[PDB]
Structure 1
Amino acid sequence: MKRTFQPSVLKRNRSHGFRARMATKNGRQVLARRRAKGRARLTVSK
């Protein structure tokens, strides 16, 4: 059966990539929270 995760790196970067997060002020707060928590990987990337 067709499961929910059908990967596509183009759609992955356009939806959750770094520049997508930096576009809006809400996405920038996501990066702020993740930097504060000390995440090793801020966003989806290679």
Structure 2
Amino acid sequence: MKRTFQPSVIKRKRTHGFRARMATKKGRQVLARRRAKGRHRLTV
């Protein structure tokens, strides 16, 4: 049956992407937190 993840690149990059993170103060805090943890993947 239909499952929860239905991938779409535009939708992924528009809800979770780098510019979407940088558009908000809270998204920039997400990025600051990911960089402080040292993640090799900042954004999808």
TM-score range, shorter chain: over 0.9
Match of 1:14 in 2: 14
What is the percentage of aligned positions where both structures have the same residue? 89
Task: Note the C-alpha offset of 1:21.
Answer: 0.2
What is the distance in 2 between the residues matched to 1:18 and 1:12?
10
1:1-46 correspondence to structure 2 within 5 Å: 1-44=1-44
In the TM superposition, structure 1's runs of 4+ consecutive aligned residues that sit over 2 Å from their partners are none
Coordinate RMSD, CA, aligned: 0.3
Normalized against structure 2, the TM-score is what?
A: 0.99
Amino acid in the other structure paired with 1:43:
T
Greater helix share, structure number:
2
Task: Note the C-alpha offset of 1:35.
Answer: 0.2
Normalized against structure 1, the TM-score is what?
A: 0.94
Amino acid in the other structure paired with 2:37:
K
